[PDB]
Amino acid sequence: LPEWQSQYAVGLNKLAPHTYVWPYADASDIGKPGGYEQSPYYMSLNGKWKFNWVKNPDNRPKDFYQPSYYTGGWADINVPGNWERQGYGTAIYVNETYEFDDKMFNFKKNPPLVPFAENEVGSYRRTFKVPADWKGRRVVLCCEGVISFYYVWVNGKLLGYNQGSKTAAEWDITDVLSEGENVVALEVYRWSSGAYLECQDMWRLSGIERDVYLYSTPKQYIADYKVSASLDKEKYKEGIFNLEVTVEGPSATASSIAYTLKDASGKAVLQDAINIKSRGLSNFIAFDEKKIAEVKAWNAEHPNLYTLVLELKDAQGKVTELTGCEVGFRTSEIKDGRFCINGVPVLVKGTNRHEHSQLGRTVSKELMEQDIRLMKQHNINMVRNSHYPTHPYWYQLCDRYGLYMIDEANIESHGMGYGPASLAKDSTWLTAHMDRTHRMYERSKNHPAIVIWSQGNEAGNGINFERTYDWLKSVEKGRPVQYERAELNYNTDIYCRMYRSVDEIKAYVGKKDIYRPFILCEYLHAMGNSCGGMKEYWEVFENEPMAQGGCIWDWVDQNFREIDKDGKWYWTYGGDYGPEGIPSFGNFCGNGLVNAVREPHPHLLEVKKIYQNIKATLSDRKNLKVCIKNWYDFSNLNEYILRWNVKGEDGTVLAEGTKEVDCEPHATVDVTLGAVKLPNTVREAYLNLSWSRKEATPLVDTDWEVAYDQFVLAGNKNTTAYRPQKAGETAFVVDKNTGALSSLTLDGKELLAAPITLSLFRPATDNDNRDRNGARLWRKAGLNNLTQKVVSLKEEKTSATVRAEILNGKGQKVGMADFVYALDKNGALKVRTTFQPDTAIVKSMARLGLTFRMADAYNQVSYLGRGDHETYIDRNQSGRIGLYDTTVERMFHYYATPQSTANRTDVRWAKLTDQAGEGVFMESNRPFQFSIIPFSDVLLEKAHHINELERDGMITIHLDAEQAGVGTATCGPGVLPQYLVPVKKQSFEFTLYPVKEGHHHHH
Amino acid sequence: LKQPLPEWQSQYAVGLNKLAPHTYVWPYADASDIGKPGGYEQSPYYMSLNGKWKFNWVKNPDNRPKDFYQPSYYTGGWADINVPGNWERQGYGTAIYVNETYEFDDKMFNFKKNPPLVPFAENEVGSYRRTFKVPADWKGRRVVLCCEGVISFYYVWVNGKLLGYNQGSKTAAEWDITDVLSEGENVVALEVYRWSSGAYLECQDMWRLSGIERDVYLYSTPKQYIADYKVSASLDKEKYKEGIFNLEVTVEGPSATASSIAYTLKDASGKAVLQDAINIKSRGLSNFIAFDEKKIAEVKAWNAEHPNLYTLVLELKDAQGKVTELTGCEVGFRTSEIKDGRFCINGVPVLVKGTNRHEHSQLGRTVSKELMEQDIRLMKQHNINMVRNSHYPTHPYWYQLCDRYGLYMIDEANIESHGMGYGPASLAKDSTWLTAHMDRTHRMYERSKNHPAIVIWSQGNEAGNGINFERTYDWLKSVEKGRPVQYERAELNYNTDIYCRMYRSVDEIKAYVGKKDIYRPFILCEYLHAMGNSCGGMKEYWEVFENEPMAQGGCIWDWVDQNFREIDKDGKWYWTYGGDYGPEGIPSFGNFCGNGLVNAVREPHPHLLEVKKIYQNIKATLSDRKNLKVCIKNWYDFSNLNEYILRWNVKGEDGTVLAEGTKEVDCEPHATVDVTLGAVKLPNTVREAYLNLSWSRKEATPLVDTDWEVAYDQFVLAGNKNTTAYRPQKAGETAFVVDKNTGALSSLTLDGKELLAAPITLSLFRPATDNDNRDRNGARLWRKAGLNNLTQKVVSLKEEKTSATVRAEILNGKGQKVGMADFVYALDKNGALKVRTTFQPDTAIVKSMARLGLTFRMADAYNQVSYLGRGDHETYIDRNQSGRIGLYDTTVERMFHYYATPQSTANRTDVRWAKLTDQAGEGVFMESNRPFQFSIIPFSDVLLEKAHHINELERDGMITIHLDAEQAGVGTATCGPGVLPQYLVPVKKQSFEFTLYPVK
Ligand SMILES: [Cl-]
Ligand SMILES: [Cl-]
Ligand SMILES: [Mg+2]
Ligand SMILES: [Mg+2]
Ligand code: NA
Ligand code: NA
Ligand code: NA
Ligand code: NA
């Protein structure tokens, strides 16, 4: 059997794992992320390559690696980038299973074997020329990442092969190179034994995923080096620098290796050198430990970096090679049961992140930069490399801009399960587990941003992880090592059990003799309209010293954008490619805080608010005394500016100011703002607090709001100076059969496009579809197919009382409702509703309120209530109560799977008008919720893809006295009890005011 | 109609509020960038707007988002599209390819042509919009929006304010947006229509696409700016040595104080050779400054061979002499005229070795600098000295490249109304379309009037003749005194300074030149149609061009194939053409969009190599074959042969170099020089030897290094006709079997091992090339006679121990009688099998034949091909001046050329012998009694013929062999002359033989 059918054949003739040692000509580029690519000793091989794709190995062009073989008849392929995103094969998205374990491929899972006839082969080949200056030097071929398995040849000679798609494979091709035109070929296989360990919940793709390049060094070169830059454990102020270097290659004469540690300024702070001479082919050099008093420490808030410059020299002292990396002084450890950075316990405010773009697993520098920019802007301080090491550029960015990292080994055998068949318990797979672990470690061991090593993901627990854990502990004395499937067994330094509820977190921290902190590997599943219940999670994290937070599951949605025959775009997910029957797990690949093109979803804004590091509470309402808590770990509040004000419900600034508060990290401080005169013309005022940074960073300028808060101040509950004036004569008609308000006119003009009815359903969010108290129960009760049947109707000159039965499409009695429509002297229509559900049929409701439709011409929306964005009761700490203007089209968020959206909470009043200024003012007798969308609930619920959405000329209005929160049931807890809609007799009202504001012309 | 139809339905609404056509006046900060192609893009006064734009597409204008141009309009829910780039190549609409018709004139769109109207409900609307910020250093300056090219029609808005609209997709449309710009975020929007009245003048034989095709950008100048300027870099008409410099400049905008305009013409080293300055100050917002004529003695002249360029630096200065604006262009001193009935550059009559060129890439009409550089590089490498901008002005960069690398250009106005015809309804005769014609002509001229590479102005293409074209001709004449103006449809009427009638045959060329009172040279606007396996008969064309003073060549039709590359469900790629996109019934003219010398990704077709050989500027003839004295003609117009190196050698048929050397020769342009290489003894072990000549230049060019072969020739030298030293040795015991029914050689064995996968039969057909499918003597007759469905039937058979004689009837699929065949199979003492054949066709049924030879198949394992013959590229009898005879090694796969439409390929001419073996070295050696032709392909003849797309080609494990005693040329019948008489297979009785030697 071929090598790709063996779990043992992880590689052949490759260079031993090591830290990146790119040779530089200019030491100045070492501090520049990706600067090594501009070195004259570096040559990219990215670009166009001849390509051929075939299903079944027996049909492949076997001799294509021979230089003489003709490829001129082949097409070109872009390298890097998965081939499925370039017109070949089929992209498949499955979760806990292996895509090849399906009848479509006539194959059943059976490690280490994978399908033969069904396997796919992508043959890559391109020509290249070595620079003249590389004459006589050593040349190395580096493939940063190729998925699944591949053999590689240079000028017809087989270099070897590789398994392990997320870390680089390298080969010394010096003795195989020729003068002039050279040839490099890779024969890539979609599946291989290694695939059993790459069962991550993500798109299963193929091809060369990352950069392919050449780099040149002298015959004796710097092959690897280990940095240790910590602090003294007593006061965490003195830097402790330790360095070890490995030189390899033959050398008959003497030589030496010297190093210089420079500060950002350029001044050398540490320097040393050792002489070497040996007939052997490798030299291990251990430098004397050095100290730096008052060293500039590295942390997420202040990513101070020193530059390490290594130089290999001749016996004459001439520099033959120069290389290096950035160095950050800090400590990472679990002290007294708590995770601490530089001796300071820190709250982990993170997110998981997969590498994803429209090209597939390939991610550009621009996208990597945008990811980290958005992360910092949204108060995220930690990233977990979602189940595999990332492109080296990512680590460089985190070092530079300050972001903690949980680097992770490319190991996930979810498909084999956690039972006795788990590959974690199969010793024949130790080679594969250890290989991936060694590669993860050696390549990134010197990055200060990495604070935690993760052994892998849901690959089971047993001997293999006990061994890779032991190995990691033997080489790493400055970073905790964790693994979620080890749960509470010895082989994990942090308890990171994923998706546990608040109660389960409390249960853990309240257990006797625990010695490790609880930091969720994954929590708050952000699929679709989600992230509800975040507040409950953080009230615990902020109160329990050994419950330090976690990483939100997924930063960016794994969707691809396609355009249909009518030019309508949509996001794609499982099952959207290939013939019927193709393995699929649907829309579960989109779980991000932002969409595939990095546009934030509304819930990311909730995350920004909950993750902010400056939190205040109102201590004294009359004199406005606030208690500020500084949640930064290494920054004083005086590094930020407080910009406050007080505004009436009408939006006028009643008072304002600017302060600079001094406060130690983790300390609280009181700041009195002073009483404010509230007019009798406002029912309430709002104390607004907004913070920004004095000094800008390259990712966040001085205008960005880093944290904010709001407190509601009571005013004149009796004033009505907000209500609009009478616009004219208002009239209403009641349907004699449904009892619903079928007509509402203003001087004869009809305002309704659909009648006002009782609404109890909501087009299911993805969480609603899995929540124990969600859509399953709403659809079972038939709450989405409601009908009203009058049993009593008493009309009057200006009012009408009615009792009607609420029936589902089955005829069953969902409940009983009473409506009282009365017309006020001001022309305003008050609508009181009293609903009594039949608890024997209705086990849960999505909302309780009224719904109707209007022409889509009424697109101008204005409202007094919570924020500029979408919020729900269990996700509304974010935003601000205030006056907002927008449009219906603007409020609609395009979730991959069309679902409920555009909700606004803590609403006092909402208003909708057309270009001419005509419309309606809507309010209740207490804060309510509302949503206006450009589609019908019917179509929104039915649609599973964006492109199915179609307008019909009407907008849909929902006025809610009650509406459930969203939870995170797609994976983890559903909506908490206190956010579920009560299923009991309830009464509520809404008053509609017709309005005529006129047509205002302006720029 | 209560309301008028929208602007896009009127031939008069060509533009609104746009800048008057002018030469590019990009403001620079670093004069050093003027002489650099595309340099202006690096200026701090230039800001590109290319990139990601919000996009929305709809069929039916009534369905478009009307208020999208308003900044407050929300586009967050829209997708993004790349700008520039036709939208059909970005997943929107339907790419359509039609030739002489309007794609909207079809039942599918419920519309019939009716100028100036285009469909309404079926029209497409592409809504583009993006945000942008203005550079802080642009505060107070004039800012201009420039759209280099958008197709069919579009409205443009900035910050919600309608700037105007435009018709004319191949020249820039600009607007002064200074007054509508605002601090902070600005918004620019374009509402583009697939069809508009202007489309009636954009009926070129090319893909019909939509959207923003070229760069969109902003540039800023001060309030008083350099609006336009006209350069005239000529030479005296008596000696053509003294350069004459003239320059006019137009300055627009206000200015309270005094100002002045100055210029400095610098040579390549940066030294000033001319300079002057004029003062100006007016209450008028427009000032015209014409400088005094200056002269340069022995000025460095510009031409395709030596494109010496000067740099014109213009500076607008304050009252204090402070520069307010810097700009300029490259200057090339030369004259272009029709002198004594002959086209002459700098007083010299030049042969036009050109090609037509459309702008094409996988993104559509949009072409990258990388592709433009490749185009020009390949052109120069293959000895092309002229390029015709195939029916529309190109992107500015193309002209800059031609100025710098030396390539003559025929710029052409974006005017073609082929769909309306040349009759009474021709838009060239409808006076209401004058504005449309004149607007496009003005724009073509103003934008490029200063490029030295442009030597001829063309008014358009296949748009009829009449009042409109006579008017535009007269206009160009009133403004241009240094360039000939031509129009092919004007034929021989007054409005054209050059007779460029397309696709005329050799006789027609001779007939014109021999006509009384002609006063204009004949230079084909288009000729030698290069569609599929084409370009036959090129030699006959150039024998005339080289010997007829007033027949000076022309431009081959199409540089590059207009095909797109797609990938099918099985991962097999293929070239697409008309009808490959959209629903059944979509307008289409099939594979006629691919007529290039190179494929869409610029890979050369075999015929470009013939072009290179015929267009070469150094040609020799063997005058004395004893002392090897050759006569060399220098065809360059401005270069002495001493700028080149001649590497020569004599090689025997066995490939051993018998003599070799290197020589430098002096020879003025158009002159000839004799060179003696000396007698060379030939061993009696070779039947012949070849005198090889190869030239390369002494000094490199950025595009052509010193290793590049710029010209070559070969002469066959007689050797010992009786030697058999070359023959392979007996490898074993040979045996054969003759089929009792067909009389075919059904078995050939070596020591009992079968070598044939299919019997050896008589072959008279060939999978049709695109030309064969239209040739008067092509595949229509071959298929009508059923030559592609032949069966042999023995009527007589007589067998001896080592030989067999048979006579058989050749019947088509309809039992008819194609002819009578006689075969004689005989084995040599050394195991060789001699196959003698005599064919007598029945001229009543066979009116034409593709070839006359044998055919059979072998396992694909036999992939090693070797041969002695005209080698290292595909050739045919009417296309084999290129390449040389010699020993060549290759594989079957390497010989198959992938023509968009699968057709015959891989043929080799002047073959002495061919050999085919497997890796182990086992196979068969093949020869005749005289030079022959052969082809070996990895597909069957049946499938190759049937296949219309490359992905339909499928291997069956067998390769197909063809040994031809005769095979027709390929001609250019797809459009123009079919195969010439002397290259048709004679339809008569003929005998021929082939001998097969099994090898091991
Ligand atoms: Cl890996
Ligand atoms: Cl134009
Ligand atoms: Mg999993
Ligand atoms: Mg035409
Ligand atoms: Na998922
Ligand atoms: Na839905
Ligand atoms: Na054509
Ligand atoms: Na064909």
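The longest strand of chain B covers residues 923-937.
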